Amino acid sequence: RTRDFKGSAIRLARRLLPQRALTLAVILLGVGGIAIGVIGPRILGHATDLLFNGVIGRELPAGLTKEQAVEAARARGDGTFADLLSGMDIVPGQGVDFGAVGRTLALALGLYLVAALLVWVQARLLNVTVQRTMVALRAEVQEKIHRLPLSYFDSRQRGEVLSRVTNDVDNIQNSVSMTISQLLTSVLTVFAVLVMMLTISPLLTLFTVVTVPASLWVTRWITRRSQPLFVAQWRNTGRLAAHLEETYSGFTIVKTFGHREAAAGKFAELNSETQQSSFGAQFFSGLVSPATMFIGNLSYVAVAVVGGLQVATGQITLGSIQAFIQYVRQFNQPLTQVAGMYNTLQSGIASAERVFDLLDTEEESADSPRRADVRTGRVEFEHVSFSYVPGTPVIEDLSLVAEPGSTVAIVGPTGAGKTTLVNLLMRFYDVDSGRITIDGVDIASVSRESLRASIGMVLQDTWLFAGTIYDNIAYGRPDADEDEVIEAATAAYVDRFVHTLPNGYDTRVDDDGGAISAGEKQLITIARAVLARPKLLVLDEATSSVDTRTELLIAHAMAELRRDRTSFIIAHRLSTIRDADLILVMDSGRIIERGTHEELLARHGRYWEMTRVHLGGIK
Amino acid sequence: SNMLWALLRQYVRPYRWLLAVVAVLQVISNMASLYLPTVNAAIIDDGVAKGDTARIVELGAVMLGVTALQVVCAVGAVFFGARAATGFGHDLRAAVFTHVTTFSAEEAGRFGAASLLTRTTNDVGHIQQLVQLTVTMLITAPIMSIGGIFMALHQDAGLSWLLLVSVPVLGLANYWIIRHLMPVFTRMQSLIDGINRVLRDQLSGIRVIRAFAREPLERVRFAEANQTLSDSALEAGRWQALMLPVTTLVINVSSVALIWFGGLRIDAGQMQVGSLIAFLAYFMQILMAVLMATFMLVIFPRAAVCADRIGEVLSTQTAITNPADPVRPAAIAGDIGVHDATFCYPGADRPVLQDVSFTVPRGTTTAVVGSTGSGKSTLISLICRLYDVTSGSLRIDGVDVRDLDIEQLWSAIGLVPQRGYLFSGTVAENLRYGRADATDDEMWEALRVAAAADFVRAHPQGLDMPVAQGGINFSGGQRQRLAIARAVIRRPAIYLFDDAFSALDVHTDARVRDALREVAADATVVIVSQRISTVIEADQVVVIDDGRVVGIGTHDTLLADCPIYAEFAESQAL
Numbered sequence A: 001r002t003r004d005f006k007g008s009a010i011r012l013a014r015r016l017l018p019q020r021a022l023t024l025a026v027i028l029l030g031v032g033g034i035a036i037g038v039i040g041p042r043i044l045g046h047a048t049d050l051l052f053n054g055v056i057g058r059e060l061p062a063g064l065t066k067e068q069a070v071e072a073a074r075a076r077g078d079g080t081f082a083d084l085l086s087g088m089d090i091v092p093g094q095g096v097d098f099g100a101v102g103r104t105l106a107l108a109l110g111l112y113l114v115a116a117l118l119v120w121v122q123a124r125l126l127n128v129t130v131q132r133t134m135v136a137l138r139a140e141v142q143e144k145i146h147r148l149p150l151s152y153f154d155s156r157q158r159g160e161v162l163s164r165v166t167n168d169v170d171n172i173q174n175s176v177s178m179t180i181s182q183l184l185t186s187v188l189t190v191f192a193v194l195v196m197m198l199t200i201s202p203l204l205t206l207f208t209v210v211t212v213p214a215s216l217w218v219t220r221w222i223t224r225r226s227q228p229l230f231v232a233q234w235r236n237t238g239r240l241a242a243h244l245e246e247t248y249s250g251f252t253i254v255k256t257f258g259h260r261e262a263a264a265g266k267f268a269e270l271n272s273e274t275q276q277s278s279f280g281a282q283f284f285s286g287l288v289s290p291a292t293m294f295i296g297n298l299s300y301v302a303v304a305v306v307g308g309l310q311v312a313t314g315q316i317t318l319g320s321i322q323a324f325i326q327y328v329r330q331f332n333q334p335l336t337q338v339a340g341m342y343n344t345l346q347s348g349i350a351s352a353e354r355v356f357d358l359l360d361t362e363e364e365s366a367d368s369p370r371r372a373d374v375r376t377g378r379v380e381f382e383h384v385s386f387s388y389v390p391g392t393p394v395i396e397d398l399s400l401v402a403e404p405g406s407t408v409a410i411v412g413p414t415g416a417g418k419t420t421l422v423n424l425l426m427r428f429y430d431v432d433s434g435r436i437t438i439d440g441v442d443i444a445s446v447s448r449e450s451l452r453a454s455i456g457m458v459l460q461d462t463w464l465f466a467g468t469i470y471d472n473i474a475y476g477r478p479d480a481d482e483d484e485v486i487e488a489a490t491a492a493y494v495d496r497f498v499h500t501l502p503n504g505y506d507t508r509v510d511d512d513g514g515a516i517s518a519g520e521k522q523l524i525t526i527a528r529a530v531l532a533r534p535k536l537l538v539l540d541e542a543t544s545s546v547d548t549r550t551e552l553l554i555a556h557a558m559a560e561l562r563r564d565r566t567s568f569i570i571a572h573r574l575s576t577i578r579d580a581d582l583i584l585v586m587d588s589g590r591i592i593e594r595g596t597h598e599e600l601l602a603r604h605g606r607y608w609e610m611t612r613v614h615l616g617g618i619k
Numbered sequence B: 001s002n003m004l005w006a007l008l009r010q011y012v013r014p015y016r017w018l019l020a021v022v023a024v025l026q027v028i029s030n031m032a033s034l035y036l037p038t039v040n041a042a043i044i045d046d047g048v049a050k051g052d053t054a055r056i057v058e059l060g061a062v063m064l065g066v067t068a069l070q071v072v073c074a075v076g077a078v079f080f081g082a083r084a085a086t087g088f089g090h091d092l093r094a095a096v097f098t099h100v101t102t103f104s105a106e107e108a109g110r111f112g113a114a115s116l117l118t119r120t121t122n123d124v125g126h127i128q129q130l131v132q133l134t135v136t137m138l139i140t141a142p143i144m145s146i147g148g149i150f151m152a153l154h155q156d157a158g159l160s161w162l163l164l165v166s167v168p169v170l171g172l173a174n175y176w177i178i179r180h181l182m183p184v185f186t187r188m189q190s191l192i193d194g195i196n197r198v199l200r201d202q203l204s205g206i207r208v209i210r211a212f213a214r215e216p217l218e219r220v221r222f223a224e225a226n227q228t229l230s231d232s233a234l235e236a237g238r239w240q241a242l243m244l245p246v247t248t249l250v251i252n253v254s255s256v257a258l259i260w261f262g263g264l265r266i267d268a269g270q271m272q273v274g275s276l277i278a279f280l281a282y283f284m285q286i287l288m289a290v291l292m293a294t295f296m297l298v299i300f301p302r303a304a305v306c307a308d309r310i311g312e313v314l315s316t317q318t319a320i321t322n323p324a325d326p327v328r329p330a331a332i333a334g335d336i337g338v339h340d341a342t343f344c345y346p347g348a349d350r351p352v353l354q355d356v357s358f359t360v361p362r363g364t365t366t367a368v369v370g371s372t373g374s375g376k377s378t379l380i381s382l383i384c385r386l387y388d389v390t391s392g393s394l395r396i397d398g399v400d401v402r403d404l405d406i407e408q409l410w411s412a413i414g415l416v417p418q419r420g421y422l423f424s425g426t427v428a429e430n431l432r433y434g435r436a437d438a439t440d441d442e443m444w445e446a447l448r449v450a451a452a453a454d455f456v457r458a459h460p461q462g463l464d465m466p467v468a469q470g471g472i473n474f475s476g477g478q479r480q481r482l483a484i485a486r487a488v489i490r491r492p493a494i495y496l497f498d499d500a501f502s503a504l505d506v507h508t509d510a511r512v513r514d515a516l517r518e519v520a521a522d523a524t525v526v527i528v529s530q531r532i533s534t535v536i537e538a539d540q541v542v543v544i545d546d547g548r549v550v551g552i553g554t555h556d557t558l559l560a561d562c563p564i565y566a567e568f569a570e571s572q573a574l
């Protein structure tokens, strides 16, 4: 829960160090372009005061001095008007002198035109420096993903890493372009707008800065009173998505057993109560401004009344009070959006230390470049003793030796260390105190890429990225023409159901009509592994959802028909594993018993009492 | 965005005289914030231009009344703005759900189950959050300009030409930047969702990407998405950098010309001095109402693509409906007569099923079998009308199935689908779907028939153990047997198992089938399975391969007559 705010902030700010030339020239350009829109109102007020001095002075007796005119005004009973006359610089009998007004306005216009191309450039440079430090972070995260060990990816929540490279970089981008453009400028418009507002009148500036505590207490009391409602609506919309999910995912079981009426009544009874919960949460949290703008007018009324009452007394000039009104309006704006600038900074700095924690984690084992080549296949293990977390040994001692061209087939109960053993062979995890030697040479000292690009593995669960079926099948060898993709898509029996689909080989299987079955999604994956033309093929229950006849056809055309290569066949259906070259029965590591099907069945062991659950039907 | 407006004028129809109470309060609340400078111009003109000390303090009472009338109709406008924008969003998802529930299996599976929930829960809430933002904080930009012109006409109308020229150019120079920015801004959201998807695919398949060493291809297909997103976000910020400067320059130049053209009037004696103070605040209020309004136009491109998906769901006419004159037999006792049924996807080269023709008598049992993808997956969903047969006819004992009311059809078909799905709640309310009024001891009979009694009875609260949302607490065959019992207590005329016993082992499959044979002694049972050990006892068995049927018979007359079935059962012995 944003357990750091200082070091994370400094690291995120120093992330802009490479773009320091375009950050210094944004800091110094949003200062000289913002302290020129503050001195603009002063010039405008001087222009309007040149008008007033002439207008209220041209009707006085021409010839009399200013002090004599004030004395005459005060002598006829006009006291407040005499104070007004003494309060400004008038010369009786002279008009407006439009030369001075024109020269003042020609300077106000000039530095209003300069200030508008001094902010367009400040915004363009700020965009360039933001959308170039974002590219670096996004390309550093992607370079870290391909270097983290698998033990990091499969030891987190389901979407914990996904909503850290996707939703936590967007917040960093938001809170790095909002606190350089919208949070820095609306602190200079609170510093300069207030230091120029104090050289005018230090009394009226006290009627404005007591609306910062007032507009903060009210905006902190509305938010911390709209909590029984901002949580009772986020929880009531959670019962809407928990009902729509279970009425859409089990839709064929709602249609049949015709509880459509009940499932619709339940939705209509908790939609009418999420409407009510959201109404209060959007009303109380929506009235946060009509209230910080109410004390932006309680201050404006006081400023206007006191400023008029003080011009009438001559303690200040009308041209100063005109500028003071604009300063009040510029100072009372940064407050109406000070919560919607602070809650989006806590969010953007909270999802900015998780990213650097991800970037601060340990990389992989820094592989050794040797480029090992598998000649025949001697995958032989030697006393492998892998353990996931110290204290619970998963795979104990085992010495499963392979052969240059046979198909060793691993069987056992669920949770016996088969998929984990496949992960050990692929060096996804590191073996502990055991050799894993493939064809004599140890793969424990071998470049991971060269080893993995020569094995060829399919797993129980399938991966299909957003693309066509053709693109998924051609992923194992992306430099193969369609005459080699369709060719190695007929040995995986995806051709027989791909024409069934509305547009075969182009179905775009991320958004399809749900017409691809679970075993049909495994045939596509097998076709992908056939493209690579591997030399040590492992099928770790890849043919689990498919038919048991297509299973025996695939693992007889690309697992036994291949005289050159050796294959591991891990599966639960023993019918396709019988008569398959050294079945290995394993139970939580510690391979119990092994051999070919005949010798293994003719010994009355765990395999013999396991082949009756499937064939004998005794359990 | 012709679908956002067609979907926005349709569903907030009833809340017409609830946005007409918002567009009449946002007018009073903006003609009262424009009236404070109006009366300040009278403090400067009636109390400052003269001595008239009391006229400054007694005219502050008018200012304090206006600032309260401006807030009672500004918090009273957020009460009706976020009360029609919550009725729209209620009626919108209540109509999305009501239309989705009319979908068939083919149409429901075309959108999905999660892309269909994120199309009715958090997809509505974007248009729903657009209505409460375009009636409370976005119509005040046109109002503060149009009513500002009329206020500048009320006060010394001679110099209202400045505000009649300064706006037509503040909404025209802002309609050009926005016109060029909108297309480059909706293209940037389809482009940042194209990198969140690349990352999602790379993280999910991080175990197989490294297996093919296809890491030179990744982060080079990501370097073409990042560097493409950073060219559409660096270009949308090239137009967004012209909004504040141009809009503030128009206001500043209008303000500078205001003092010149107002001094030319005041010197002539046909204008007062407080009118400049009033106009300089009208311009500033218009600037403030335009800047923050154009800064929150990011919602329109991101809520106009949500409306596209919602309208795609809402413009999907269902193809499976009850006939205008449905035949209603007294009893629908199972007799399936599938003749020449050919189900073909629209545009597909080869039909899923082709010329399948088999009939099952009154109380027998059939077993269809075939390889993966060989049609049989779709055969069950034709009997209960989850799909429409294109060029064939299946009939249940008296009538074509599509010439039969679908609800009375479903009322006597106990379906056990491929994957067992259980609803959140208790076992007592999850297997209650079968009968909904079964006695307590009657629900103990299905759990015995389905071989599910010995795990739900060995529980503290008996048949009341809480089930998870999707029933994920029961891992496998436990869920499958609960789903079997659900249909077991319906006493249907047609038991319809679609790859049900696959999840179970061999002993419990034979136990459940024996229990059915001893209980449903006269119900028509249709079993679909890739196994053979659950097909031996079937009264008739058929094999279908790549669509068409290859052989119809019993086990003995088909094991020595169909080579496909022979090689199917060959990979079964041990």
Ligand SMILES: Nc1ncnc2c1ncn2[C@@H]1O[C@H](COP(=O)(O)OP(=O)(O)O)[C@@H](O)[C@H]1O
Residues within 6 Å of the ligand: A151, A154, A155, A388, A394, A413, A414, A415, A416, A417, A418, A419, A420, A421
């Ligand atoms: N990445 C992992 N992190 C933590 N525990 C794991 C991990 N992988 C496997 N395990 C645990 O170790 C055991 C290994 O069994 P496993 O190799 O999955 O056998 P099988 O593949 O036959 O199910 C499992 O029961 C699992 O709970």
Ligand SMILES: [Mg+2]
Residues within 6 Å of the ligand: A418, A419, A420, A460, A541
């Ligand atoms: Mg496994």
